[PDB]
């Protein structure tokens, strides 16, 4: 079975630094089959070689006896292990800009898992130059096949929003809610101490920002824009995404709490460094996150557990690897 | 006067472990007339002999002078007595499974009472084999007569939900809110210490789980399913029912508070073991519950009082004997 | 100018103890003109002589310099004075029952005032025997004239509710929201210590109920019923009205707070006994209340001030003299 | 490009003390270009000479490095400077009344700015005598041109509200929400200690009212009325505006918090006297305010920062220079 990834292209295209993004959420597959799963593309644009490389993850799972009706003596516990994951959406510093000038795609996937099954979400970031050739491509991810379909919308220059064409910025002024996708870029630096700005933007009891994760989020808005670096103090679009990421960390019911839990991240930690909540339910939100209390990014994969993403206390928390939401942008309709 | 109990049957039936359930809420009858009241059925499936047996209840009533306009010197008090109740929905361990293999029905009633009148709710759990003979039956409960009516819905295999047929699980994926009925099964065991899981799933200040009631809930979903044991950690449907039971204990206005009260459960208790709220109003929620702070189940019958079912403090609380609500199930429409 | 007071009568009338009530809210009149204002009726049913008698009130007003833009040195203060008010809705014990057997009306008025103007609300309680003669009457209250108009609704026995006829109690069961009017009856007695029941029904920090006002509320529901004594523990209709009175004391925007204030009730009190809130705005809620902390009822008239009617702390509070609202009653539509 | 300022006039006009007001919000202009910006009118009514005079402002800006993705080592700071602003809506005592008797207009502007751009809002208060000549005028404000357009509505005497004509006060009684514009008049006086009334009307922890700003607000309601002095204790319209000003100080999304900040007002203050919140976003609310903790009005201009206008703690707060909102007025429709 094949699934479609629609990437919208306007009639008028500006070349220079614009990248477009498409995504598709795939049906659930067993957790064991996600090992060594990597995107395999057949487009004329070679995928970036760094995405297929290994990223060390700390895998956190929960387990228990769980007999019918059993509420006690379950031996409910969490297990931390070091695992190698390839193809996840771990973007490196200046990878999007280099991929634009190299005409290379960025094809990666997110994992939304419970204890037994995973919903992969395949992402592809391609330069705007893919909006003229518009050659249909085929991507293989595990047992699934994805057809990249470029569609030329009836919009002249803007974004297709509910059958209307909105130009983020010559009509009258208007505000539109525009979709945005963000990825955390792990990069050490004295200017990238992220939680120093988390402490200023939000009512966050967050001490010791010197020892917390360093990096920034990079975002694509409207499915077609220049990359937005988050946070950027004098860029209100960037600060809107910053607000959305930390006020809605799972992104913008089948979820029942099994119990709270703590885990060692990484596995070699002398004490528990991450708080999580074990749950039962169909896969929903991402299982990929980054440990807060480590300058060097410790990537976490917690199938069946929701890591603590609330920032009101930075203790034993995490930040999401990917984030999707809506931000309000000024402009006009055409 | 006769009342109908509709039990829906699909055109395609799977035999193996499926049981169907029907219920009907009967008009109010005086409290004194509910004594020795037992279901009397005329079906081809003999009712389970254990339901008509005696279950010891602690009866908690409230009383006062209550002259017109009298607000003081009412001698407002509660009285605890040991009473024998037959035919209430007290299911034993593995009773539903044995009744399936024996082709026996489980006919029982719940009591929703105020100080003077009771609304009986008659339940019947029959094996799926009653969805082919579909012989109309007659059940007598006190002054009421109930006609069991099996109706073959136009659904192929699924459940009739608002004129649509939903198959809980080959169309597209969808989520549907499905009705569910649950009964507390009292059974001693080191794996059935229920409040050990209540403490983990909910923000519940609940100490000393060793001395609290032991057992599990058994549920039928969609009016047609295999029994669901609650809680089951790796069964998200079971954990959804678990969440609904303890977040909405009365199930999913004519109710005025007369005053808080405490009662000895059982009557021989040296101190008060249960907190309740005396009320005035037409009968609404169930008057049957089980004392929390006793490993051996102490069944409580409190006409005119609502027992403390909130779990945020397990002190002097109770759990419901029966629970009806809605849970979200994955599947498709046919 | 003349105003209408519609009193609805059903086609079928039950004689025995039923009284009907009508009311009309009159336009604002200057506060000084309300002195010695008494209802003057021209019906064939003589008004009860006790209503036109004097009831001692403690009058609480507020004053200040109040120059344009003046926010300081206003000398904002309250003044307590003993005044004689006639014709207000001060019902005596068993007055409604005696008026029924005597075929006498109870004609009285409520006062909703700000600092300068008053909205009188004229009430009339007549026995059900006024629903057959149905002779149109004329009542004079100050500068206003009121025509009592009896209208035979198309209802057989029930109450006209939104064009439908509801019979509070042979159709199917249903719940209807029914209008109700209540009056506080001041009567000393060891069974009428009202706040002893306020403490039990509501989460009310209310100590020393021995020294608080004694009496009960008497109510007419549906504009046609036997009198309902409030509170009556085993009468859920009575307890619904009890709940409405103390949860919605002003009854079931042009109101700006000038400032909190305390007053001596009665004027001879050695210290402040009542808390109030001075306001500016068009007349809205009643200015008549009864002091809480005095077994002998101290009637309060506070034009331009809202007395503390919240019961969460009984300190320096009051209770309303009259209350209008809605309660849910069981019955059927005809 | 020219923008319209519509000023509605009724068919019947009452001369005596009525003034009408119009306003227009202009597109954003760079912050540097707002210096020395003054309204230049071409009407037959000369603008009041005091508006074009200099008012000393304390200018509070925020700055930081703000590289793409930079969250730390931004050197985020605020800078206070003394600047001269002409033409802002700083009304003097009795200026509106003197302008009425002198047939002079009051033309001024408000500034809603972020760190880089400003939205000017041009106001004009003219005597009611401008509703007969109705000569179209031209006003120049910076790079913008404004055409004053007087329109004779189809209302006889009232205000045009959603296509209907409401007469604030011979039809039936009714309540209408009416627009109102208010300006803070700074005037020293023992009767103008504003926060003495703020403390009484609102639950405000506000000590030391002797050392807080002195003055009052002056308002025009319905775009046509006699001036309303705020607060006026016995004027419920005035107290409604008083409530709206302090409950909705910004008046009756593109706003992301960069961080809290404190500033010295005036620049010569030995310690920080004003709390603000630095933000990023398109210009929205006014950047003009008055320092609370100084009897002599200290006008503040904080482009890109929202001054603390919440009154629950008067510490380091401010009050708005201008306020627009809605108040409920009694009257009738014609
Ligand atoms: C995990 O998700 C799958 C697919 O939705 C579901 O079938 C399975 O029961 C889930 N496991 C849990 C909730 O433990
Ligand atoms: C109990 O319920 C019956 C039936 O609804 C009602 O008639 C009776 O008044 C109630 N008793 C109370 C509320 O004390
Ligand atoms: C009192 O009410 C009258 C009538 O609504 C009104 O005209 C008057 O201004 C009010 N006085 C106040 C609010 O002080
Ligand atoms: C200020 O507002 C202008 C106009 O809306 C906008 O272009 C600019 O980015 C804003 N500056 C910020 C938010 O720092």
Author numbering:
A (entry chain A), B (entry chain A), C (entry chain A), D (entry chain A): 21 to 189, 198 to 280, 290 to 371
Kindly provide excerpts from the paper associated with this entry.
The hantaviral envelope comprises a lipid bilayer with an outer proteinaceous shell of two glycoproteins, Gn and Gc, which are synthesized as a single polyprotein precursor (GPC). Fitting of the PUUV Gn ectodomain crystal structure into a low-resolution reconstruction of the mature hantaviral glycoprotein spike complex revealed that the Gn is membrane distal and likely shields hydrophobic fusion loops on the Gc.
Here, we sought to understand the architecture of the HTNV glycoprotein envelope and report the crystal structure of the Gn ectodomain to 2.15-Å resolution. We note that two loops (residues 190 to 197 and residues 281 to 289) were not ordered well enough for model building in the HTNV Gn structure. Indeed, although the acidic tetramer more closely resembles fit 2 than fit 1, it is far more compact than either fit and exhibits a width reduced by approximately one-third (50 Å).
